[PDB]
Symmetry: C2
Subunit: 447 residues, 2 copies
Amino acid sequence: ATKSVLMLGSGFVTRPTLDVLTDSGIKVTVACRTLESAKKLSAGVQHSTPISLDVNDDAALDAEVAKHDLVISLIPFHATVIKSAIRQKKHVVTTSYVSPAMMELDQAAKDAGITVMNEIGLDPGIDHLYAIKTIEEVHAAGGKIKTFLSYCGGLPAPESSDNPLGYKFSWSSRGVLLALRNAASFYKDGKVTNVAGPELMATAKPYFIYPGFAFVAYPNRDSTPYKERYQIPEADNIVRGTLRYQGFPQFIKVLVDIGFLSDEEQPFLKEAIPWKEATQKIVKASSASEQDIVSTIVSNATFESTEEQKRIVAGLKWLGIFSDKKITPRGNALDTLCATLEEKMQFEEGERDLVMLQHKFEIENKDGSRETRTSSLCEYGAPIGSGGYSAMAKLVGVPCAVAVKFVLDGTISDRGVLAPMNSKINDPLMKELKEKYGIECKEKVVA
Amino acid sequence: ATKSVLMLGSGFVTRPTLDVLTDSGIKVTVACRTLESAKKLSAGVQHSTPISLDVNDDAALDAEVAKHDLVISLIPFHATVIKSAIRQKKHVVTTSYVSPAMMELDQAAKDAGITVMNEIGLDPGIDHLYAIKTIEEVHAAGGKIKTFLSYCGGLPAPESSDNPLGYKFSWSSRGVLLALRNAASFYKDGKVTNVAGPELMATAKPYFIYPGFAFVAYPNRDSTPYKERYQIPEADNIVRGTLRYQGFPQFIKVLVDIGFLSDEEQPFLKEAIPWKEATQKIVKASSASEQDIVSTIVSNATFESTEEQKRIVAGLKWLGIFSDKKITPRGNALDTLCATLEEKMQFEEGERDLVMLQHKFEIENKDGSRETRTSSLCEYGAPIGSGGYSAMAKLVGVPCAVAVKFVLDGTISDRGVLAPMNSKINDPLMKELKEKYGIECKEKVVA
């Protein structure tokens, strides 16, 4: 009964998932575009095998999928992976949202007799388990969920947050930045509300959680489907979003107004030219001198105060965009900036990760009374270089590994395209995560 | 040349100091009022000896002081200890401020040929070393210190800060609370300014340091002497104070207005009566019901918003002052409350400590230009129960241990009552702390 799994992905989360599975006697073949990449994320790990595989090659994917009992997709390609799993009749586990194309394969998945478990990372994943656990507790008590809010963020521990964005990139900064262009839809005062663009960041206000942290919160993706998903018809306000630290909204805006986020390719950004010229050109400065560039930046951009302005300007200088530092030529203002962002804002040795996840429920009790309850999870990662897991890697990778084990042993047996949307699936998942890994959200009241 | 030291104190900081000294071959006799207390803080530690000693007994103190080469005072008794050291001609090291009574013994200390090194903990101590290092660097460059600000705080790591005050007591909460009554004096716009009482907390505004933290800052003790001590005659603003987290100023005020900080002993607070009655009595409530007590509390106290009010009220309830929980009878409202505070707000297993120290200098450069520079130190302690040091214990205890070693080997040879107020003393201290323990403040510019 030695089960084997095909793991797709050459990223952050792969390790914890790999460790947990192999530690359980489950064999895992790690597939990346490159053999090196796979060799890396698998060196020294028992029961693992690295290979080069082109996931977009339908014929090649099917051949490899058939050799295992389940395929794990931690990569970007989801429907394609599911279609192969359907042809080969193997199960699937992903940490991504169920998209329209994935749901479209629901019936075909059921006919092939396979389970496609999605949204079982940190968020989506752990957040679903505890949001639903609490909602059902409330409802069981005859209470009403009038407002449901959920915010989550993978950030630098405060200790190591001293950079312009109070943020450290693990994945492409280009992706993070462009994502801020996406529209967010949610329920407010009982009505569907849409927000995007500067407006999104202009709405990112301070959001209290614990005294020691200074978070700001904003809507992310589509929250409207949850009135149905979490069965909270009585909810007037439903919002799922992300957490950032104070100052993030403001530095992002300046980068925008300065035009550094332009996707446009410039002929003058093809060679390693000093940062000075780049910015002076991108900004429209009379010269490459700090004075001029800075005077153009401020005179055109609006700030909250002289101090914020002073701070944001020093932040820009800190990036090195006003220096003799040659650029990492990428043709795009955004791309070029991102290269430097990557270099200047990464987690370094000894630094720690931080995950904050908090659901908030304003409740109207059976007795007519009211109360506000929270369900929170706050965890720090192990220092870089210590060999331990970052908080993000652990909280995404372990839930995924647990789901994989449950689909393989039958604990999760529903066929089709699924998400952790009910106690039949969620209870076993929460019990294993908490009892075996100490992973859980704790409840508390306020109001 | 086997030196020996008499260590006075049965507290938090004793361990790191003890460990460092004994690890250096220095014998230490740990003295506490109780032999048990001493036996505790010394069990299993090589080259240490515990004893019972009454520091207030002049004859007893002299006898013991004479048996060692130096006396370390980490206890509350300073002048008394110094007088004994003067009679016995032994050296002294303390982590406290040089008081008028201590300075009065300066000449007598010099005549006895001894060194009395004070203010060598974290704050006072490390803060002095780096404030002076930076000021001299600036002055060397011909710059002017127009404003000097320094704030420091020993707090719960954000992760474990979720309590009404965003604070955890290591030492008596009664002391902490009463200290908020002390007047703070500092320089503002070139003039001596005094602040105390509600005013002190009403002035505790948000103070930005790093994006991830939400600190508030306020003046502490006497900063005026520093215009001379740090030789910054050109400074218009000189302020040394403490850091707390957001919300601290507000919860303290409610406790005040509710009268919970009254020193008055009540005949009804002599027996273990349920918290309900206590508060209802102390507050002046129509009943011991949450409604009444809460209605009296709010109707009389003013808040920033309904939400803050809601939050602060839930915080009070969290303390258990509205419950059937019997009180730990202490006659005083403050004392009784403190017993519960002690119990509810302590560092527990797995929890981490946090020390934030930051000097800020607004400078006018030789070129007439201006700049703002900071010197910071941010450190987390080891989880309670892990056996490692808390940040506070390490940062107070290690600097002290280093000073002790320097007075014993001659590195610090000036006689009299001293403080780390110059490079002759400060440089060796900073070098050892940074090179051997990695303890230091890092500089950065802004503006």
